[PDB]
Design a protein around this ligand. Structure first.
Ligand SMILES: O=C(O)c1ccc(-c2nn(C(=O)c3c(Cl)cccc3C(F)(F)F)c3ccc(Cl)cc23)c(OCC2CCOCC2)c1
Ligand SMILES: O=C(O)c1ccc(-c2nn(C(=O)c3c(Cl)cccc3C(F)(F)F)c3ccc(Cl)cc23)c(OCC2CCOCC2)c1
Lengths: 263, 260
C-alpha cells in the first residue's frame, strides 16, 4: 500500500496547487528576492500602495482598524479556498453533511495560521497574491491592541518555518488537520478517524522520502498542532477584547454578517 | 538514527526505572479496579458518611479532599523528578534547563499518570486501598466539584488508547524532554534526547500494539490535549485561590505555579 499512499500524496498536492492562489514555493522566491513587490513599511507607503496597486478591502478611517479588517476580509476568502480543497480529500464528501460543516468550522483557524506562515518570514508578509510585502515592524507598531494582535502570528510563523516544509508536505498536513475526530458535536467520528489514519500514513511516508535526513520530522510536525491549538485559543481571547473595547469597528451590517465567524 | 537493539535497550531501561520510581503502576491499578480478587479490594468512598468510615479503615470536606489531591500531586512531583534523573542525558543538561523542563512538564505528567488510576466511575486513592467515586467528587460544593470532573473527562479518553506501563514510561520521558518549553537556554541538546526517545516510543508502540494503526500519532495528538487541560487547570486553580483562604499550596507546587 506504499503506492496508494504516494497516490494519495500526489492527489492532495495537485488539488492544493489548484485551490490556493499563492503557493509556498512561489512565496519563498519572492521573499528571498529570486516582479518586485510593493513594500508597505509606514503610513505614507500604505497610502501610495493602496492608491497605485489597489489592495482590495478598502470601504472607519483609522489605519490600524483598516489593516485589522483587511486580515479578516482575506481570512474569509481563505475559508472558501480551504472548503474547496477539503472537497478533494478522498472520503470527505461522503461524510455526513453536518460533520463536513463541523470539521470545516473548527479547522479553518488552524489551517489559516498554518498557511499564513508560508507567506511570512521574520521581516514581513506577502499580500495580494505576492504583489505586496507589508513589514513586520509596521504591523507590530500599530497602536493599542492591534500591534500586539499582529506580532504573535509572526512569532508562530518563524518557528513553524524552521521545519522547512514544502507544498507537497503541507497539502497532507492541512488534510490531517481537517479530519480531526475530536471536534465538538461530530456525529460519526469513526469514518473521520479512518480517513485521518490514512492521511497520517501518507504524511509519514511523504516526510521520510522528502526529508530523509530530518529525524522524527513527522513527530515534530504533529507536535506543532500544540502550537496551533494554543495560538487559536489565544486568538479568540484577543478578538473578544477588541470587540468589547473598540467603538470604531462598525461596518455595514451585511459586511458584519459576512465576517461573523472571524470576529 | 538508532539501532533496533539500542532502542529496545532504552525502552527496557526506562520501564525498569519507571517501576522503581512510581509506587502504584497502571498494572496494579487495573488489577485493583477490575477486582475478581479478594485480597486487593478497596474501600469505596461515595458520600459523607463513608468518607468518615474511611478515615478509621485506611477542615471542610471539599477543602479536605482538595488537600488530598495537592498532597499526592506534591509526592508525584517528587516521584517524577526522580524518574527524570534516570532519563539518559537529562542530568547532563544545563541545570537551569533541568528546572525548566520539570517545571513545565510535571503537570502534564500528573494528568497522564492520574488516568492510570481512574475508570469512568472513580479514582484509586491511598496507594490503591481506597476508591473515591466520580459522582461524589463532582458533587462537591462551589468551585471544587467542577475542578475534579475535567480530570475524569481526560482520563476516559486517554484510557481508550489502552497503553500499558512500558508504553507510558517512554511517553512520559518524551513529554519531559520538550524543547519548546519557555526559557530554555540550550534547545538543541534537549531535542537530540527527545528524538531518541521518540524513536524508542515508535518502535515500542509498533511491537506492543501491532494492530493499533498510527497509535504513535494518536498518542502525540494526546500531548496536545494535555497542553490545553493543564492551562485550564492552572487558570481555574488561580480563581479558586482568590476565594479560598483555607488553603495554601505546598511550596514546591507554589513555585511551579509562579509564572504558570
Ligand atoms: O493570504 C493569506 O492566506 C492570508 C491568511 C491570513 C491572513 C491573516 N489572518 N490574520 C488573522 O488575524 C486571522 C488568522 Cl491568522 C486566522 C483566522 C482568522 C484571522 C482573522 F482574525 F483575521 F480573521 C492575520 C493577522 C496578522 C497578519 Cl500579518 C495576517 C493575518 C492574511 O492577512 C492578509 C492581510 C495582512 C495585512 O494586510 C492586508 C492583507 C492573509
Ligand atoms: O496518586 C496520584 O498520583 C494522584 C495524582 C493527582 C491527584 C489529583 N491532583 N488533582 C489536582 O487538582 C492537581 C493535579 Cl491533577 C496536578 C497538579 C496539581 C493538582 C492540585 F491542584 F491538586 F494541586 C486532582 C483533581 C481531581 C482528582 Cl480526582 C485527582 C487529582 C490525585 O488525587 C488524590 C486523591 C486524594 C483523595 O481524594 C481524591 C483525589 C492523586
Amino acid at each position: 500500500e506504499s503506492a496508494d499512499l504516494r497516490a494519495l500524496a500526489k492527489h492532495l498536492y495537485d488539488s492544493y496547487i489548484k485551490s490556493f492562489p499563492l503557493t509556498k514555493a512561489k512565496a519563498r522566491a519572492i521573499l528571498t528576492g529570486k516582479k518586485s513587490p510593493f513594500v508597505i513599511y509606514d503610513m505614507n507607503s500604505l497610502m501610495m500602495g493602496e492608491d497605485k496597486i489597489k489592495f482590495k478591502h478598502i470601504t472607519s478611517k483609522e489605519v490600524a482598524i483598516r489593516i485589522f479588517q483587511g486580515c479578516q476580509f482575506r481570512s474569509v476568502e481563505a475559508v472558501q479556498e480551504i472548503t474547496e480543497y477539503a472537497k478533494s480529500i478522498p472520503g470527505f464528501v461522503n461524510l455526513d453533511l453536518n460533520d463536513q460543516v463541523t470539521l470545516l468550522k473548527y479547522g479553518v483557524h488552524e489551517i489559516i495560521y498554518t498557511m499564513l506562515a508560508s507567506l511570512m518570514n521574520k521581516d514581513g508578509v506577502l499580500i495580494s497574491e505576492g504583489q505586496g510585502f507589508m513589514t513586520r515592524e509596521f504591523l507590530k507598531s500599530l497602536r493599542k491592541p492591534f500591534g500586539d494582535f499582529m506580532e504573535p502570528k509572526f512569532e508562530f510563523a518563524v518557528k513553524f518555518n524552521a521545519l522547512e516544509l514544502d507544498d507537497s508536505d503541507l497539502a497532507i498536513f492541512i488534510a490531517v488537520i481537517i479530519l480531526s475526530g475530536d471536534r465538538p458535536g461530530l456525529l460519526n467520528v469513526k469514518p473521520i478517524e479512518d480517513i485521518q489514519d490514512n492521511l497520517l500514513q501518507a504524511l509519514e511516508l511523504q516526510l521520510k522520502l522528502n526529508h530523509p535526513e530530518s529525524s522524527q520530522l513527522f513527530a515534530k510536525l504533529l507536535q506543532k498542532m500544540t502550537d496551533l491549538r494554543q495560538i487559536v485559543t489565544e486568538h479568540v481571547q484577543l478578538l473578544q477584547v477588541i470587540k468589547k473595547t473598540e467603538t470604531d469597528m462598525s461596518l455595514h451590517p451585511l459586511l458584519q454578517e459576512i465576517y461573523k465567524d472571524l470576529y
